[PDB]
Amino acid sequence: MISNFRKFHGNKNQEKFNENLILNKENESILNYLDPICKTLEIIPEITYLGSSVEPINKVYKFNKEEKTSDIERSELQLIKMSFLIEKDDKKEEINKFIYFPKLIDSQYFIINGNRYYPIYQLLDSGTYRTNKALTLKTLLMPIVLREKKETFDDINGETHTMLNVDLDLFKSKVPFLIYFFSKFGFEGTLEYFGLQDLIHVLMKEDLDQLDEDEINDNVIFMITKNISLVVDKNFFSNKNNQIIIATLLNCFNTRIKIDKIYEKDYWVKKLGGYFTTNNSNKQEKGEGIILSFERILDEWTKKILRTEEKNKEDIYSVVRWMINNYLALVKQDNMNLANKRIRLYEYLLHPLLIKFSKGTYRVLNNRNSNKFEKIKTIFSNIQEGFLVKKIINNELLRYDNSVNSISLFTLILRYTQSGPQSPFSSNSTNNKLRGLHPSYLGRLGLTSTSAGDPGASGSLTPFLELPENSYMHFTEEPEINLN
Amino acid sequence: MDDISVIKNEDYEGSHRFLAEELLMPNANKTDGNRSTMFCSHLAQAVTLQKAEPPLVYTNFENQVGKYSTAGYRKANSNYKVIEKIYKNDYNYVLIVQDQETGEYTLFERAECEFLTEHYGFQWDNDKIDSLKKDDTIEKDTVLYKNTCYDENMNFGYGVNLNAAYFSYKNETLEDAIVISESAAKKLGTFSVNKVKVSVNTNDILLNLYGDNENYKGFPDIGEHIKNQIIASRRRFDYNTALYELKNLNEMRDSDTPFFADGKIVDIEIFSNVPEEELKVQKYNEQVLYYINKQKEFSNNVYQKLKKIVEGKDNNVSDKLLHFYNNCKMRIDENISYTYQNSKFSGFIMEFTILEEEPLNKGSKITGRYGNKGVISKILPDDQMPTVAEGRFKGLKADICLNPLGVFNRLNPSQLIEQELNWIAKFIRKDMEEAGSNEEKVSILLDFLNRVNKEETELMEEFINSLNKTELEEFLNDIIENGIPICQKPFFGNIGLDELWELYNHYDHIDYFKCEGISTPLIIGEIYMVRLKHEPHSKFSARSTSKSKNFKEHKDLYSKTPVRIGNMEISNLSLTNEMGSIMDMLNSYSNNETNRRELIMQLLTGNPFDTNIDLSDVESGTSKILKSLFTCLGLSIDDV
Amino acid sequence: NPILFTIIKKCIPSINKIINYQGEDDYIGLVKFKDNFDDLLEKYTDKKKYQKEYDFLIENHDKIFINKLPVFSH
């Protein structure tokens, strides 16, 4: 009859929905996000993170003579285990921490406190997001921010050039980017890392006096000090990003320096520490600690998400080099291009654990010098069993099933929201551009699906959307700007 | 971005990848973006329909939407075998099954209704799961229970097809207003399911609203509908020691808390923190006791049956079975103190699940897939609606009449194309019925479809040639009487001005219908229609002098939230230039308690048909408090 | 803690309202505030102005709540 024909036509459509996108909630693994959050604790020498496993709660109820209280409203939950090994001269103890985490029911929703809550994907920027006077890469702990300023610079001839100087806005201070590099690599080592050793040279004043005048007009030279001079190649001078590097170097060198101090790493360590601390005698300790924190900035998750050659993602220094070398290109990138953006689901669910862990790290490292073992035990003990569940619900990251329909493919299953706990999108920010549509949206996002109350904040994902495998739920394998 | 040169049509040609919710909308290229976004909003606002039908004009993605929206159907995920069946109520029951591969023991739950939120819910077609008995194998992809949206072959429908004509009906179809046939309104029917909690503490008792003197029943039974919109009413007592209030069972008072809903209750869940012996002595608890016992009887029944499986060492149990078993075991176990909102409660808390068939009523909002909106202004008998006369299609009556004025202004032309296609299809169906063999019928069908959709024509030729002669005759009769499927893809494959023009030129016999009392000839063609969530009940407020949230807690029939008068309203009223009367209304209605008491008393003691109120001139209580406190402050007004 | 009240007040402006019963969690109560202090402190903070105060509160979690009140010699 008619019904059989209708089923036959539906099966022969030739336009088929991506089952993997619809069912990605089931195929997403909590452990992938849990592991880096736990490894943030590894900064403490005693704490070493062994592993994590999500296990079903499997306890048969047994009659207890003692009084037992059961809530009428029921929550279906699962247990996550985080196993850590504390090894120190004091003792060796293994800490296993149990946390309650919501469990998926029917492959797309959660049931907590007697209510049906559905998780919805969030739209976020992948990395290297532009900001006023700055370029920022987001990290789990401290975002790495490059802040820019415009300053006058004077040539050996007396020629005045206006150049941009980039400072890392980190650890609550704006510190020139090159000195961070000098503190670990060294001046010659930093030049070798950037590969600018041959092009840019430092010479003494007398060497400048004997040097050929023609070369001086051919290659730009700058006066670091009365006795110290810096010469730069003309072709290197042409590029504006290379000018950024040179201007940062000029800011690095104050006039009251000797050539010997330039070639000593500990001088740069002292300057790096001096930015942060008023006391001038503890500069080295502060500087080395800052280098360590700088190395802590980059986490494995940001490395996996980042979409550039692995040589540039090896360490924090490689990332800073990549950003500075391509600063001009990266600042000029479209915020709304879906190539420069991604969707995430489980990350923000596990994010509050990072806040709790970070509070614990601050407590053990900075509060007191008392016996560490009990304190690092307190870090895990301080977290309550339902911390994740309570934060997920009370902070209202999750969405109640206000559905009036059995139709769920677009109302809940494939719904995305730009608004989030950490949201570039805000009503006060007047993100009228963000509320609009962009040509990249075609084939990935719904052009006409949004809510009149908050237009552009929420929308429906395309049923045919293909998220590239091995791109970590990124719309495109590569960002907007090729950089090659 | 500013640049749209990146968008090239050849790249997206033949693909609906750029469409999302509009995959359910035919001829989406012809509809404006505003109407499309309204349609996307309507689909989420759409309510389930008992008699939902697959659209006559379809996009062919509807079944996929039914497939991947799992809230409407339950599909087995493995081969299973039915170990046993346990009953809590006639309507609610549980089926224990064993995986034929894993050996794991799992359960499936059957209930009449699905609750979503507020009053929204839908009834279940539980035919297959009810058919299953012990030692019956459940195949891998069997659908145990389905929503009314899905049909016998699991086709998906969110609305009903209604014959529509654009006609000006006595100006009742003004702006976006619709007149519907009573039979047609019967088709557009929704369910309402409500979970209502009545909490009765030690000093509270439930009045004998549903029971006689010999048998005390204070609330409806599992198979009985609610009467007078009152489930039960609780009277709180200062001391329950006397039990002198036995004679008070029939009467009701304002102090009593009444719980309001209408429908058939289908499940009762009672959470009791009182020992059984304390409950048994009082006859007024008798009805409650039965259901309490029933719950225990159900729980114990599962415990005895599954104890070997759960508490055995193998423990091949699903997490759902384990938690169900643990909860029932907690229920039967002693020293189980139930807590609600993290507090131990006296007496017991009852949850009623109530399912009611809610019909279409005036003020309901219905729409099509093209962003149009309509409000049901009038429901009229079938005879009063436009009926064509003196034709082969004689006596055909229009189910719905829509406003003709402004149709093109809406910028949603596609509704008209749907209407024209179903109207031309009526002629094709009558042509098939009137004459020919089965071969002639398929020839006419294939030609018309070749005019509309080539892919449908090709697939229909394959499907028809597959059919046996008896099956072919049955399919043809289905097409003649029930309707003809027509495929109008959202962007690629829909017909246009030229194709409809050719269709009209070829089929010269097809012309407007001459209706019984209408000078202008009319076109009557089926349009797919959906029912929206909005009803007037949501915003109704009415208040009489003596938010409270009682209405949200089901303690009030309707909201009594007061209306607010502000400076703008006072100015518009001051247009009259009679400020004294405005102040009199303000004092009598709100500000002045003495004047308010005078108004109420005079309204109830004066002549019913002549009302003249004289209000005393007195300072308001707020003013008195202000003067007292200000004098203590040390400042006094001088009538500045 | 009496000494730390001003430091808590700068971080959490609603402390005065919350403790008494009369934002979203306005006038919840002292015991409710005590249970939810970590949530409230994160809820009410100035990113630039009160970061130093927030770090001090992290350092002295144990000293925020006072169970024993001293009375000096007569």
Write up what this structure looks like.
This is part of a larger assembly, with chains A (484 residues), B (640 residues) and C (74 residues). Chain A is of the alpha+beta class and 484 residues long. Chain A has 21 helices and 19 strands. Chain A has helices spanning 2-11, 19-22, 24-27, 30-39, 177-185, 187-194, 205-210, 213-218, 234-238, 240-252, 259-262, 265-276, 283-297, 300-305, 316-325, 327-331, 347-367, 372-382, 387-394, 409-413, 432-435; strands spanning 47-55, 68-71, 77-87, 92-102, 110-112, 115-118, 121-125, 129-131, 134-137, 144-154, 160-170, 173-176, 201-204, 221-223, 228-231, 341-344, 399-400, 415-417, 458-460. The longest helix of chain A has 21 residues, at 347-367. The relative contact order of chain A is 0.14. In chain B, 30% of the residues lie in helices and 20% in strands. In chain B, helix 6 (286-311) crosses helix 7, helix 8 crosses helix 11 and helix 9 packs antiparallel against helix 10 (454-466). Chain B is globular. The two termini of chain C are 23 Å apart. The chains are: A alpha+beta (484), B alpha+beta (640), C mainly alpha (74). Chains in contact: A-B, A-C. At the A-B interface, helix 1, strand 2 and helix 20 of A face helix 1, helix 2, strand 6, helix 7 and strand 17 of B. Strand 2 (68-71) of chain A pairs parallel with strand 17 of chain B, so a sheet runs across the interface.
